[PDB]
Structures are given as C-alpha cells and as structure tokens.
Design a binder for this molecule. Structure first.
Ligand SMILES: Cc1ncc(COP(=O)(O)O)c(CN)c1O
Ligand SMILES: Cc1ncc(COP(=O)(O)O)c(CN)c1O
Ligand SMILES: *c1coc(C(=O)O)c1
Ligand SMILES: *c1coc(C(=O)O)c1
Lengths: 396, 396
C-alpha cells in the first residue's frame, strides 16, 4: 500500500532549524523562528500561565471530556476579546464559539464546516500569507486563490491592487483577512481601509474569515480588534479563527477558537450544530489544559492583569527591537531607508533582502532568515543587534 | 451562506446525559456513560497523573511547539506498549508514531493520510461498532462497509459470519479491528481467532487498521496486545490508532497516537512524511500536556508502577461489577442466562435488552442505557446493583 508514496516536500522550517543547530560558528543568529523570544533568547512560560497551572493542579478533580465546543467560559471570554464587552453580536446571541486545538485547528474546523455544509468552493488569501493557509483549505477540498497585498517597492499595503484582485472574487467566495500583525509582512489595513473592505465585502457577497493569531501584538487588545469589529458591524455572517499560542505563550498546548456568526440565534445555533459535527469527526473534543489556563486567566481580575502586562511587555519589546534595528542599520552604514520596519506590526517583517542575500547571510555570516527575507524581530536583542546589522550591511 | 443549513442529527449522548440530569427521581442510575467511574461514582484524576502534572509544573521552562509528531519519548513508549520491548518492528525501525489529539484524532489522521496518499476508498468496520467510526472515515471521503460480528442469540462472536462478510472486501481495502474490549460488545477474538484473521488478511490483501482505545482493560497490557502482535508478525504494513483517554483517565487532554508500519525504514519514513503533512494541515502539532504526562509516567519506573496498579484497579473493579451484575440478576429472579457478561471484556456490553425495554427502564425506573441496550458496567456499584437489577428483572 505504501511502497510508492511520494515523500512530502522537505519541511523548510526545521531544516532551517536543523541547519542553525549544526552551525558551529559563534555569533550565529536565528531570525527564522516562529515564536516570541525575550531579551535572553528564551520563550518562557508566562507567569500568569504558571499561576493558572498551579491552580488547576490544586483544583481539578476529573479529566472527564469537555463538550465538543470545549469550556463555556473560554468561549465567553473569547467572544468578549473579539467583539468587545456589550457587543450587539453577543447580546443578540449571534455568535457561537468552539474551543479548538490552536489557530490551525480553528482554520481546519472552519474549512471542513464550509466544505460540507455550504456552497463554498474557494478561499481568497493574501499574497503573501502564512504558507500553511493553502495546505489547510486544500485539505478540506477548497481551492485557494491569491489577492495582491504587498507593495515590494514601498514596503506598504498595495490597497489598489488588493481591491482590483478581489474583484475576481465571486459572491459566496470566502475572503481571509489577517486580523492584525499580518504574517509575514506586519502590514495591516488602517481602520478606514478596514471600513472600506467591510463595505466592499457586503456589496460583493464575500464571506469574511478572520484569522486572528496575534491579538495584542500590534497596538493593544481592543485596537487590534478594530478591523474585525468594523466587519462585524456590517455583516450578518462571518467566521473568526483565533489563536492564543503567541499572546499567552501557549504554543504547544494548542489553544484556539473557531467563532461562527450568523444573522440570528436560531440560524447560528443550527449552523453551529454542523460545526460541532465536523469537530466530532476530527478530534472529538478539544484539549483542556491550555484552554483551561486561558479561561482561568481571562475570568480572574488578578491573573488577567498580570497576563495583560506580560502581553504588553512582549508587544513593547518587539517595538523596541524594530526601532533598534532601524537605528543600528543606519549607524552601521546601510545608507538606505528601513523606516518601514517601525511602522509594521508584530513579530514579522519582510527585510527587503532577496533570496540570494538571505542565502549569503546564512552561508557567510551565520544569520538565518526565511528564503522570502521574512525576519522575526523577536529574534533580535540589544546584544545581537550590532553583529546582525553588520552582517546585513555587508550583503547590501 | 448559513440560512439553509440543516441541523446535525440530535446528539444521542448528551440528551441522554441531559435527560438523566433533569430526572428528579432518587435512585436514578446512568449506565449510558462513556467514561470509567470508580465505586463512588467519580472519574478522578489518577494519582500517577497528578504526580506527573506536579513534576511538569515544576520543571517545564517553555511551551514551545512540539514537532508535528509530538514528544519522541511518547512515541517510543507507545511503540513498546503496542509491539513489546525488543519487537522486530522496533529493532528494524519499521514503525513511526505521531502523537495525536486522542484516539479520534489518530483515526482521522489515519483516514486523511490514506485518502490523500493511497488508493484506499473503503474501510470495513464491525457491526456493531463505536458510531463515530463511520463519521471519521466518511469525513475523509472514505466509504464505510460493515462486517458481521455479533451473534445476538448466543451473545458471542459470530466468527463464521465475520469471515463470510469480509470475503466481500477487496485487496487494498482497509479492515478496522478493535484491539481489545470491543466497543460496544466487549467480545474479542481469541488468540487463535486473531491468528486466523492475520493469515486471512495477508492472503486477501487487506490493510489492517487497529483501533486500540482500551489497552489494559481486558486482561492486561501485554495480553491485550496479543491480537495486534499476531497481525504485526504477519504483515509488512498496518496502522494503529491508540488512545490513552480511558487507561490514563486523561479523556479531556486528548492523548492518542497514530502508528504507521511499513516493510522497512526507508518506506515508513517516506510514508510518514505524508502523515505529518496531513497533521500539519489539520491541527499543526499536538497538545503537550496530556502526552507529556503519559511519557513522564511510562518512562519512570516509580510512576509507571503506580499507574499500572491504578489501571489494574480499574480492570479489576470492572470484572467485579460484571460478576456482581450476573449474581444479582440471578438473586433478583431474572431466571435467564446472563453468564456472557462475565466473559466479555472492558466497560461495555450489550445487555440483551430491546430498544423498548431500554426505553421502559428509563421512563419507569430511571435506569439509563443507550438505545442499543449497551451498558457501561463501570456505572454499576455495590450500592446501586440491587435496585438496578430489580429494575431490569421488572422489564424482562
Ligand atoms: C496567520 C496565522 N494563522 C494561524 C496560525 C496558527 O496558529 P497555531 O500555532 O495556534 O495553530 C499562525 C501561527 N501562529 C499564523 O501566523
Ligand atoms: C473504539 C474506540 N475508538 C476510539 C475512541 C476515541 O477515543 P478518544 O476519546 O481518545 O478520542 C473510543 C472512545 N474511547 C472508542 O471506544
Ligand atoms: C507561529 C508559529 O509559526 C509561525 C510562522 O510564521 O510560521 C508563527
Ligand atoms: C469513551 C468515550 O465515549 C465512549 C463511547 O462508547 O461513546 C468511550
């Protein structure tokens, strides 16, 4: 049965990680990482998370299965983060949330739900996007089409190209939007651009699918949800796939949510029953530990305060590294405008380096980025900034 | 998009759980439960698990993502449980294991892998089986066919009917076998029957898929794997979907494994790369907490000893309840042979009651079973046995 199976394309992350490991050079630097790292190069467990885990160890009396949609408090706190406390969508009971194994799990549950229960055949994704988006939608049998996004000349959002591309989208197609901290570019629509897109989506009959993996990493929890909320004000229906992997540092516990919104309670409940069916036939019910940590934190004033500060600390360290990177490149004689880095949001940006410059950085200087030139600014520290920037200047 | 979606068929578990909750009668008894319960009617966290969770709280320094296939030690311990320490399959590196979100996750990963990378179109499942088997395989686009299994007259394995049914299976079809503690019947093949099936499967070109959700609940860890090991001795290729939900009481942490076996290391590694691709496009990588508990326990002599005794305690309590049930039915004047209950394995058996007797038990006596007459013997206790049996006798 298996003798003729073709191997999956080589895993580019890992391999990049593998090459980094094998590199014997002192002063090697890994900007190809997916996760947040602090000033010491660690990805620690958040203190709020450790406190919540201690509480669960002390208080849990069973591991009895959660419902298909997971912990009710997790769903409620999730909807409040997304839509705001006192949102009409919440008051009108127009939203239902399933706790999922990570953002990826949320996207796949959305995809399976759409493939099996609707006429959706096609999902529109930005060029560029997280590479796994295509894999997830394709796995559910959905076609993926790309819309223009990145102006490589000006390192900004090519808003005209975006709108023009999306004119090819038919009514009933899904359009995927990154809620904030676009991956890989860090370029997000302004509120007015979000509002323009919200109106256009209503007019054209697109089903919006928001992917919200970085809430809090751009400007703040509420500000980062403005785009979503602009859409939610205008649409009867949408879906949100969210992730707590980065903003709680809960990567490996697989903590996310798929939130379904419809015109009214009757309709969302009926549709959600099929979303639960899609979950039941996939992983049955979701993993408790990580989501329980999230619910415990979000629902407790003390823990939530500690967590919000920890998130702020991450967001601020990222911003500081963006500023330090631009300053240091200027001071090391780059003689070229990198100011776009300060205005971009989250861990990721395109450096503007070519694939060959990236290869040269790895081979000659032991500086590792993704082949697209995407860099994780959280891989930068005050201590590694100078040699990193000297390496970059050398390949310009 | 959602206005015309048909609601999923009513969830029969839940609803049964809901009806039980709403029942105001004292003396109500729930035999429709899916989980293990102890003599006090609780599903506690195992002591070995609490000890391991304390160790993880003290020692974990990151929640950084696991690899796609999860914790290496978890994979190694899993393969040893399945195949035995020093197995040729292990020594020859013919097996690869992915840690998954539960047994269900393992089955779905198997299904997606098979649908996308092989000619498999059809999976053969026992009549009866766990109802979610059909849902999982169908979700991946695979047809499900049934093979005869249960002799309702003698409450035994209809081995002739089984072999005759499976003659319709074509070479390259998948045949699913419950490793031990068949769900819902508790009827397992003898070793000689397993050996007969192993030979037949080789001759007919079936790909065996073992579902092993109850290892340790029949006779013991090694004995319960005899059937699998008989197949593994004969086949170049097979797949095992295993679950630690019942035998570690880790239900809600979603702890299982999908183990792929091929003729040699080269072939299994190549095929496994596609299994990892199927995981990446589903939930990305698996939840750490539960699997880390399992690895911590299985790899430590002290914790593993505590856990093995806790598992033995569950297995023995189940057996005691089977014996007590048969004795008490005789003593309450059933005047009918229920001895088949003593010979069946695990939490579940068909009581032999009809759908209407089951309905009558719920309505008149507040005794709850599944409509098929399946009962969970772990819902029985010394204290509830007499009224339970008096209720059953009354509807005979
Ligand atoms: C845009 C985007 N969507 C979803 C995911 C997947 O998130 P998770 O690791 O929680 O599955 C990521 C990675 N955090 C991402 O960058
Ligand atoms: C035969 C069988 N297969 C798989 C499963 C699913 O296991 P899990 O709850 O770990 O997903 C079950 C339920 N334990 C089962 O009875
Ligand atoms: C978090 C995990 O992976 C990423 C990525 O960009 O690949 C973010
Ligand atoms: C464990 C969870 O569900 C079962 C079942 O038979 O439904 C076992």
């Amino acid at each position: 049965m298996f003798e003729n199976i073709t191997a999956a394309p080589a895993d580019p992350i890992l391999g990049l990680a593998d090459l980094f490991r094998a590199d014997e050079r002192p002063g090697k630097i890994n900007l190809g990482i997916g996760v947040y790292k602090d000033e010491t190069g660690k990805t620690p467990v958040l203190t709020s998370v450790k406190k919540a885990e201690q509480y669960l160890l002390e208080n849990e009396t069973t591991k009895n299965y959660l419902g298909i949609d997971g912990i009710p408090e997790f769903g409620r706190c999730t909807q409040e983060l997304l839509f705001g406390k006192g949102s009409a969508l919440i008051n009108d009971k127009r939203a239902r949330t399933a706790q999922t194994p990570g953002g990826t799990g949320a996207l796949r549950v959305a995809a399976d739900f759409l493939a099996k229960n609707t006429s959706v055949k096609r999902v529109w994704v930005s060029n560029p996007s997280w590479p796994n988006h295509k894999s997830v939608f394709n796995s559910a049998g959905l076609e993926v089409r790309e819309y223009a996004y990145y102006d490589a000349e000006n390192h900004t959002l090519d808003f005209d190209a975006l709108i023009n591309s999306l004119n090819e989208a038919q009514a009933g197609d899904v359009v995927l939007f990154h809620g904030c901290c676009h991956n890989p570019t860090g370029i997000d629509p302004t509120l007015e651009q979000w509002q323009t897109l919200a109106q256009l989506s209503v007019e054209k009959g697109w089903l919006p699918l928001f992917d919200f993996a970085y809430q809090g990493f751009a400007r703040g929890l509420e500000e980062d949800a403005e785009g979503l909320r602009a859409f939610a004000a205008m649409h009867k229906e949408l879906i949100v796939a969210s992730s707590y992997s980065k903003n709680f540092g809960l990567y490996n516990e697989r903590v996310g949510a798929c939130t379904l919104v419809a015109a009214d309670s009757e309709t969302v409940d009926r549709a959600f029953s099929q979303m639960k069916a899609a979950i039941r036939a996939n992983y049955s019910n979701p993993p408790a530990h990580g989501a329980s940590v999230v619910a415990t934190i979000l629902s407790n004033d003390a823990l939530r305060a500690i967590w919000e500060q920890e998130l702020t600390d991450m967001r601020q360290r990222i911003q500081r590294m963006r500023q330090l990177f631009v300053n240091t490149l200027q001071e090391k004689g780059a003689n070229r405008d990198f100011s776009f880095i300060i205005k971009q949001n989250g861990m990721f940006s395109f450096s503007g380096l070519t694939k060959e410059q990236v290869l040269r950085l790895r081979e000659e200087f032991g500086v590792y980025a993704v082949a697209s030139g995407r860099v994780n600014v959280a891989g930068m520290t005050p201590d590694n900034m100078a040699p990193l920037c000297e390496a970059i200047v050398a390949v310009l």
